[PDB]
Every structure is written in structure tokens, then in C-alpha cells.
Design a protein around this motif. Sequence first.
Motif, mmCIF file in Angstrom:
data_model
loop_
_atom_site.group_PDB
_atom_site.id
_atom_site.type_symbol
_atom_site.label_atom_id
_atom_site.label_comp_id
_atom_site.label_asym_id
_atom_site.label_seq_id
_atom_site.Cartn_x
_atom_site.Cartn_y
_atom_site.Cartn_z
ATOM 1 N N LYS A 1 0.857 -1.217 0.000
ATOM 2 C CA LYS A 1 0.000 0.000 0.000
ATOM 3 C C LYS A 1 0.879 1.247 0.000
ATOM 4 N N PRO B 1 4.782 2.306 0.048
ATOM 5 C CA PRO B 1 6.135 1.782 -0.144
ATOM 6 C C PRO B 1 7.167 2.286 0.858
ATOM 7 N N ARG B 2 7.907 1.333 1.421
ATOM 8 C CA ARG B 2 9.075 1.589 2.243
ATOM 9 C C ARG B 2 10.230 2.076 1.359
ATOM 10 N N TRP C 1 20.571 3.304 1.633
ATOM 11 C CA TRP C 1 21.449 2.183 1.925
ATOM 12 C C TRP C 1 22.794 2.577 2.523
ATOM 13 N N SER D 1 -1.413 10.455 -6.629
ATOM 14 C CA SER D 1 -1.246 10.352 -8.082
ATOM 15 C C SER D 1 -2.549 9.943 -8.781
ATOM 16 N N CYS E 1 4.795 1.336 -15.901
ATOM 17 C CA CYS E 1 5.085 0.051 -15.241
ATOM 18 C C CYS E 1 3.811 -0.729 -14.905
ATOM 19 N N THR E 2 3.917 -2.060 -14.905
ATOM 20 C CA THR E 2 2.852 -2.942 -14.420
ATOM 21 C C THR E 2 3.498 -3.970 -13.494
ATOM 22 N N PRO E 3 2.708 -4.752 -12.739
ATOM 23 C CA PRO E 3 3.381 -5.786 -11.929
ATOM 24 C C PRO E 3 4.225 -6.804 -12.741
ATOM 25 N N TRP F 1 15.131 7.835 -10.349
ATOM 26 C CA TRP F 1 16.492 7.529 -9.924
ATOM 27 C C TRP F 1 17.476 7.642 -11.079
ATOM 28 N N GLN G 1 20.240 6.020 -2.422
ATOM 29 C CA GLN G 1 18.906 6.373 -1.948
ATOM 30 C C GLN G 1 17.830 5.737 -2.816
ATOM 31 N N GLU G 2 16.975 4.897 -2.230
ATOM 32 C CA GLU G 2 15.833 4.415 -2.989
ATOM 33 C C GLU G 2 14.854 5.567 -3.278
ATOM 34 N N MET G 3 14.168 5.467 -4.412
ATOM 35 C CA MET G 3 13.229 6.507 -4.834
ATOM 36 C C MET G 3 11.970 5.911 -5.425
ATOM 37 N N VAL G 4 10.901 6.688 -5.393
ATOM 38 C CA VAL G 4 9.585 6.228 -5.808
ATOM 39 C C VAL G 4 9.161 7.217 -6.887
ATOM 40 N N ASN G 5 8.737 6.706 -8.042
ATOM 41 C CA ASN G 5 8.386 7.547 -9.182
ATOM 42 C C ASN G 5 6.902 7.492 -9.471
ATOM 43 N N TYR G 6 6.292 8.659 -9.686
ATOM 44 C CA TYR G 6 4.859 8.741 -9.970
ATOM 45 C C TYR G 6 4.516 10.133 -10.437
#
Lengths: 404, 403
Positions: B1, B3-4, B8, B22, B28-30, B368, B385-390
Motif C-alpha cells: 500500500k 512503499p518503504r 542504503w 497520483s 510500469c505494471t506488476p 532515480w 537512496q531508494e526513490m519512488v516515481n509517480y
Amino acid sequence: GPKFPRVKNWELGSITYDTLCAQSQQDGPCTPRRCLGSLVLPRAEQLLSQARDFINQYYSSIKRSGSQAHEERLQEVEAEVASTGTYHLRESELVFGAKQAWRNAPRCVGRIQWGKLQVFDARDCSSAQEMFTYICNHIKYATNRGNLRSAITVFPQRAPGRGDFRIWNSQLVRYAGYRQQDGSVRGDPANVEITELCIQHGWTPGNGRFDVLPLLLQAPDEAPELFVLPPELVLEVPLEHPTLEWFAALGLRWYALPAVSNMLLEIGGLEFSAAPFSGWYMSTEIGTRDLCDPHRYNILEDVAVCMDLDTRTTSSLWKDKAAVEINLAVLHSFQLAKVTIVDHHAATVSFMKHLDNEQKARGGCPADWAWIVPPISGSLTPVFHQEMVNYILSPAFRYQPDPW
Amino acid sequence: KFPRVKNWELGSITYDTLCAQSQQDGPCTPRRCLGSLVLPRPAEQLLSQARDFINQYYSSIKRSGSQAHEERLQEVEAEVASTGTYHLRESELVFGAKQAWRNAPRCVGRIQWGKLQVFDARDCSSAQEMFTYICNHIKYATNRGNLRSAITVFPQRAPGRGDFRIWNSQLVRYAGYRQQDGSVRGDPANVEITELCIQHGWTPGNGRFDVLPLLLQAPDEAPELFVLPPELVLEVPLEHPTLEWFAALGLRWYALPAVSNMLLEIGGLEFSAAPFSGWYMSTEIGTRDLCDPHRYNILEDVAVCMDLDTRTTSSLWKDKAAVEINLAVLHSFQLAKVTIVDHHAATVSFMKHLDNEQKARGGCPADWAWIVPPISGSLTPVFHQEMVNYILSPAFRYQPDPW
Ligand code: HEM
Ligand code: HEM
Ligand SMILES: Cc1cc(N)nc(CCc2cncc(CCc3cc(C)cc(N)n3)c2)c1
Ligand SMILES: Cc1cc(N)nc(CCc2cncc(CCc3cc(C)cc(N)n3)c2)c1
Ligand SMILES: C[C@H](O)[C@H](O)[C@H]1CNc2nc(N)[nH]c(=O)c2N1
Ligand SMILES: C[C@H](O)[C@H](O)[C@H]1CNc2nc(N)[nH]c(=O)c2N1
Ligand SMILES: [Zn+2]
């Protein structure tokens, strides 16, 4: 018009379409709402359909698809699952599956070598001592006095209600990290936990920056047992720079053999919890990540001071200049010592060749752009300009959580 | 639901909650990630995007649910219902522009997002007037080298007619001339636009750094050609702090990075010509513009000047020359006293921005692959650094070339 992901190279303007991604039978972490491509970790009848699929893959690869040998193998597999809840791979099926897992690994830039992999079968192994013998044999063959050879050793698969074969070390060869009085770490900060575990299981530790860790090996339903690698088996390369005479005086070194020991190898639903594999290094792994990551050896400042750089401002590019020399030092030292290594330029060029081979053979190649692009000089390498589609194909290697 | 998201290098974890805001799907898809792709391919709808945007605006001024809020929602209802569209108040446009920058996932410079000069050019009715507005923008943004972020917003798209468009992808760009030998003089990325300019009557130069004219298009008209006054285009000759022969290469770049081909979307309205500018991060010039093989491709030239062994990849001649070219860019801009940021300074400030946005909004959309610099990636903190795109709205959106 094609109803498959369109894939473009922005250097050359060339286009392909990935049809292989339709073969993917496992979801990644992305949705239409948000891309999670940069996360390092995404978190009965089932076995049979996975087994059936792998066997189809095997018979396709030997061009005997639809043959009665194919249908008989199918029948033999479901009758095994019918009466034991599991089944077993034939020797040539294991060899096929292991290579296919490497071929399928999105994060690996060395996949042009995928068809050349020595598969040691160790599914007979029944003790931690025997795991040790097997591992020593692997290291010897793989190292080959510096003429490195790709290899994997496969220990027995997960059994229902029987404990797992596990190698506790994340790699077969890694340096100790000793937590210090003043909070700092001597050696490799990445390895503080495994170092502390080795000591708790009876290892007398050293006090150096580069102490090879012993192995912690777990046979089914037993506490892990400790095994020291005899030093003659662990080939190491002392680091020197081709023109900077003082670099050798730093006493830096690295080991020849990159050997992953903590990954799960999955084939046709069967799970091989211990199946260590090894190749040869790309130089950026050592020179950029291992030696320059702030949370690793962190040598960038030391080297820039030696180089007489202005370390007090970002725009002198002192980090960039020092990292380049360290990388050149890794390459020159391995070359001098006659140990196989590949620089990031040759590795990525060869991966572009691999993309083209796979486009013809399978209609695509799963690849993790963030992992394929090297950590220095990214856009100087051809892969930077190459769009990539990432998806999970099986057989696969899988990260598995630490057994402790 | 939710994202963490993990760093690192430092071991720290946040959770992105902003992403539930968003409204638009990415590629992207699964089944497969397409996150590395550069571009992936009624009244009721506009009304809800408008309501939502107006809601954002009043929330940002802390006047949420007030009389001015309710009466502005009514104004928008009434305008859309009668005409199929509506118009933004200047202050709302100002808000929307800053927010589109804020929301831009490929931009590493977003620490600056709250500081943006906004020129309202919606009262433009000719290519001529567009040209005047563009000239004020350039002069303003350049400011004798003390660069200031700016955006100029031309009239929105309208259902009954063609778009206002700037044909150029950036306001300042160098020409690329295809040669008899099939090589290019100048910038290979701009061969096509150079050819259009010539076709629409431009007398072309013959150098490697010829500043292109502008092709500006008012609705349903042929584009018109306008030469930028050379005194308005600040340039920086490139020299090296210690390598004296470098200046002899006669290399140069322009001070002002100004995107002119993107579409700005606010509250459902679309601004097809809304050029914006900031200042350069040095790697854009030093690494991509000068070193890309399909750009000026100067790497081998420089490495040979430096007397490096070019015969073998393992001497790392490419890496060595790339660093020196980047250094020369930084030094030259600092010497000419023109604003520039190196990729270490930029990415450190971006990390700070992530922290600010986490507290402000519970996340920050980031690509990223675009945020991590094209040299020395893992040497910057963003690598780890992890990143989330939307896609959040207001937004900048890619649009196809008008020809
Ligand atoms: C032949 C020489 C090889 C080279 C140059 C090479 C190169 C690389 C590199 C650079 C990475 C990224 C590692 C990192 O950044 O930590 C990687 C990852 C990986 N490689 Fe290869 N590799 C080689 C052989 C192999 C072999 C023999 C296998 C398995 C049979 C393999 C499977 C993998 C897997 C599964 C990963 C992902 C590891 C993870 O997720 O932690 N590679 N490789
Ligand atoms: C103030 C200093 C700024 C810096 C240092 C900066 C830095 C950057 C960099 C390095 C990129 C990637 C460029 C590339 O690789 O082509 C980028 C992209 C972008 N920037 Fe910023 N930027 C700044 C200001 C702005 C402003 C004022 C805006 C708009 C108001 C903006 C909006 C964008 C957008 C929409 C992109 C993506 C462009 C695309 O997809 O082509 N930036 N920026
Ligand atoms: C949390 C986490 C997740 C994950 N998937 N991998 C890791 C470890 C990544 C990692 C770190 N150092 C080393 C390696 C092995 C890299 C490696 C393996 C082989 C076979 C050849 C070669 N050149 N390089 C892998 C950690
Ligand atoms: C096919 C395609 C897609 C896409 N989204 N962008 C592009 C162009 C990307 C691009 C190329 N050169 C230059 C820029 C400008 C980048 C830029 C913009 C601003 C405002 C500040 C700054 N420092 N840098 C952007 C091409
Ligand atoms: C956050 C990010 O995904 C992470 O730092 C990745 C980026 N790319 C990488 N690429 C490789 N090859 N190895 C890595 O460890 C990483 N780290
Ligand atoms: C294929 C790949 O996504 C493409 O080359 C991207 C990679 N990262 C980038 N990053 C930035 N800042 N700018 C770019 O143009 C690109 N190009
Ligand atoms: Zn994705």
C-alpha cells in the motif's frame, strides 16, 4: 504497432520490442500508479505447474518439444509429486536450469558468459564437513591460479519438514569487520555481523583491515559449524598504481574470487538454498564500491590527500579524480598479477552484444538499468543510453534473508 | 500500500504516502518495469481536475473552506459549464508553475522550487509578441551571470484552434550542419531544427557553436523566424585550471538552460508554450553535451591532448578525460562568474530536498535514473537512496515536435 514494450537505444536510434516479458510468471513491485524499480529488495498445484513449465523449457532447449520423451518426463514428474509432494531434477536438467538462472538474472552485466558455467552437482552432500570439501573444490577450480572460471556448486534442495543446507556467509570470500572501542570499524563495515557471529561460534579473530573470514556452514537441523579457509586457496591481489608510486604503500588489497553464497536458486519450483556461484570481477566493484562507498572502506579522502587535491570544496572534483585512480589501480594490479578482471567499458560493450544475441534468441532480455550501469562514468558506457525492461523469469536466483 | 523507502548508506527508512495522490498512470505494471524508458507511448473530467487544483491552491494559502475558496470553485463551475473551459487567476498560475517544478521527478534542482519568477504572457497574440516575451525572459534569467529561475507562460490550448508553440527544444541551442561527408559540424542533436530554420529563411553560420534562431508559432500560422540578439545570449569560453592547451580547443557553452518544448498542465488546462530556465549542473555540459558519442563527442580529442593511451579501455582514458572536461566547465563558469552547480553540491542539496518534502508532503516523486549524475554516480548520496516515481499534477509533460 506491436503490443509489447518498445525498447530504444538513444545513442544509435535503434528500436526493438520485448516479447520475452510475456513469459514472466511472477510480479515485480511496480504498478501503473508508481514505479519501485530502484528498491534493492522487493518483498500442491503450484509446484506442479512450475515443474511442468521448467520441463517444457528443458525440452524446448534440446528441441524435443512434444516428443514422447518430453511427455514421459512430464508424467514422471507429476507421479513423483503425486506420491512424495516433491520431485528431483535429472543431472542435465540441473545444468540447464543453473545456466538459465544466470541468463535470467536482471542485475548481472556479465551474462554474455552465461553458456559457459561449470555446474558442480553436490546434491549428494550430507554433512557440513562435506559442504566444506565441496566449497574448497569449487574455489580451487574457479580460481585456477588466476585464470578464473565461472562455476556453481549445487547442494541438496529444500525438503518438506527437514531443515535447509545454508551457507551463512554472504560470499565465500570476504574480509572481517571489527567493531572498535571508539565506535569505528576496522576492516569491512559491511561484515560486522557475520564477523561477530564467527567469533560467537569460536573463531579466534585477527586485528587487520583485510582478514579473510572463515565459513559458517549449516547442514539440515544442525547448528552451523565453522571452517577456516586454508590461505593458499584464497588468491589475493596487492594493490599498486601504475604511476603513483606511493599507492602501494597504502597496503590495500582485494581477493580474486567474487563468489555469492547466500542466494536461493529456484528451478521448476524446487528450491536450492545453498548453491554458491562465482565469476570474475568487474573492476568498478572493487575500486568504486568496495573501496570508496562511505559505508565501506571509505578510502577516497585518504587517496585524495596523497594526490594533493583540495578536499575542502566539492567543485575541485577531488572525489571523481581519486576514484578514477583507485579504479585504474585495481585494473593494473589484477593485470600485473595475471588474475582475470574486466573494466567497466569492456563489460558493458560485451553486455550490449549479449542484448543483441538475446533479442534474436528469445525476443528480449530482462535487465535492471540501475544495476547494469556502472557506478563511475555511467554515460561513458553504451548501456547508459539503452532502455531496459525488467521482469522476473524462472529459473531464478533469489535473495533470501540471513538464516540468523 | 505505502512503499518503504530506504537509504542504503545510512540505514534510514521513510514511507511514501504522497504517491496515493497520483491520478495518472505511468508505464510500469506488476509484470514488468519500464522505469528506464525516456518516453512511454468531457467537462466532468476537466471540472474535477480544476476543483482539485483550486483545492490545492486555497490549501497552500491556508484559506481552505473560506468564502473566497467557495466562490472561486463556483466561478470555475460556472465558466466550465457555459464555455467548456475556464481561466486561471495570475496568483493561481504562479502557484501551479512552482508546483509543476516541485512535482518534476527528473529534476535534481528542486530545492529551489519555491523561488521562481513567473511571467504571465497569456496576453500574447502573435509570434512577434512571443519573441518580445522570450527576450525579456532571457535577459531577466541571465542577469549578467547571476542566474535566476524563470518561467514564461503563453496562452493556453483552446478546443477551437491550434497551439502556441516554440519549435525549438531549448531557447538557446547550437546549430548542427550535416556535411557532404555525412559528418556533422556543430551539434548533432540539432540537425533537424537547424534544417527547419534554414528552410524558413535563416542564413546559416558555419561554426560549431552557432546559436540557432527561434521559430515561434502562433495558432494555425506558419512558424516565424527570429534571431536572438547576440548581446542577450551569455556564453562561457572553456579553459582548464592547469591544462593550458585546453583553451586552444576553442570550446564554449551557453549560460542559460531553458526548456521550450514541454507542456505545462495546471488544473486540467494545458500550456503548450511555457518555456522555463534555471542554471546548469556542470555534468550536463561536461559529460553529456561534450562527451556523448552522438553529441560533440570530444573525449578522444581531449584524451589525446592529455597524451593518454587510447588503444585500450583499461587505461581508463575515457574516465580521465571526462573528469578533466567537467573540471574545465566548473572552473570556466566560476571564472566567468556565471551560476553553476557541480553534481556533488546538487545531489547533496537534493537529499536535503527529499527530507524537506518528506516532512512537508510525506514523499517526493523521483526518477532515480535521471537524478543520479552521468559520472561518479555512487560517489554521490543519491545513488544509495531508494526513490519512488509517480505523476503528480500540476506537471510538466513531454510533447511531440510540432512538425
Ligand atoms: C563471469 C563474470 C561475471 C561478471 C563480470 C559479473 C558481473 C556482475 C556485476 C558487476 C554484478 C553487480 C554486483 C554488485 O553491484 O554488487 C553482478 C550481479 C549478479 N550476478 Fe554476475 N557476473 C559474472 C558472473 C556471474 C555468474 C557465474 C553468476 C551466476 C551463475 C552471476 C549471477 C549474478 C547474480 C544473481 C547477480 C545479482 C546479485 C545480487 O542481487 O546481489 N554472475 N554480476
Ligand atoms: C535552478 C537550477 C536547476 C537545476 C540545477 C536543474 C537541474 C536539472 C537537471 C540536471 C535535469 C536533468 C537534465 C538532463 O539530463 O537533460 C533537470 C531536468 C528537469 N528540470 Fe530542473 N534544474 C533547475 C531548474 C529548473 C526549473 C526552474 C524548472 C521549471 C520551472 C525545472 C524543471 C525541470 C524539468 C521539467 C526536467 C525534466 C526535463 C525533461 O524531462 O526533459 N528545473 N533539471
Ligand atoms: C540487500 C541485498 C540484496 C541483494 N539482491 N544483493 C545484495 C548483495 C549485493 C552484492 C554485494 N557485493 C558483492 C556481490 C556479488 C557480485 C558479483 C558476483 C559474481 C558471481 C561476479 C561478480 N563480478 N560480482 C553482490 C544485498
Ligand atoms: C526525447 C526527450 C524526452 C524528454 N523528456 N526530454 C528530452 C530533452 C532532455 C533535455 C536535453 N537537453 C537539455 C535539457 C535541459 C535540462 C535543464 C533544464 C533546466 C531548467 C535546468 C537545467 N540545469 N537543466 C533537457 C528529450
Ligand atoms: C538505491 C539503489 O537502488 C541502490 O543503491 C543500487 C543502485 N545500483 C546498484 N547497482 C549495482 N550494480 N550494485 C548496487 O549495489 C547498486 N545499488
Ligand atoms: C535509457 C536511459 O533511461 C536514458 O539514457 C537516460 C538515463 N538517465 C538520464 N539522466 C539524465 N539526467 N538525463 C538523461 O538524458 C538521461 N538519459
Ligand atoms: Zn518500474
